[PDB]
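Reopening: structure tokens for the heme C complex, inputs below.
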Amino acid sequence: ADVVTYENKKGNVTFDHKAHAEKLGCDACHEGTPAKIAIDKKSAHKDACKTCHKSNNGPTKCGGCHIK
Ligand code: HEC
Ligand code: HEC
Ligand code: HEC
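Re-run output (same inputs, fresh job):
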């Protein structure tokens, strides 16, 4: 997807794939041949999601990605 969504009990998160990529350039979420990253509450909450935001706008204040 260019955009993706993950609905979760702690609130739904939008994923951008293209929309992130326009700033990121793939090899920032990915490295060396991109493929299906193991999204879970081990990866996501490590550098996967909870790193590359504190030096950006939008999500940071815990209640960021997760809406409702
Ligand atoms: C503030 C520090 C946050 C709290 C509290 C929680 N999150 Fe997250 N989160 C993100 C993703 C992509 C996932 C993976 C979905 C999965 O588990 O497969 C999660 C997951 C969780 C979960 C487990 C699911 C549930 O709803 O119970 C919990 C308990 C949870 N998160 C609490 C992404 C992000 C994210 C984007 C950068 C941020 C800022 C946070 N999560 C922050 C919090
Ligand atoms: C972090 C915000 C990402 C950016 C930026 C890019 N990708 Fe990505 N990609 C990401 C995740 C978390 C996943 C797995 C999604 C899931 O929950 O399964 C992926 C997956 C891919 C895949 C396989 C699935 C697909 O959509 O084809 C490929 C081939 C892929 N990603 C390529 C790719 C490229 C070329 C990017 C730059 C334009 C790019 N990704 C950015 C997370 C993120
Ligand atoms: C850098 C390598 C990033 C990674 C890895 C992830 N995200 Fe991200 N995210 C990043 C930036 C630069 C921004 C701000 C965009 C801007 O225009 O400046 C974001 C934004 C988000 C948002 C908010 C989207 C919105 O509603 O405006 C969400 C919901 C978000 N990011 C989620 C998210 C998740 C789930 C990630 C782990 C798979 C993830 N991001 C990785 C930079 C980077």
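The helical segments are 18-24, 44-48. Residues 11 and 66 are 4 Å apart (CA to CA). Marking as resolved unless the reporter disagrees.
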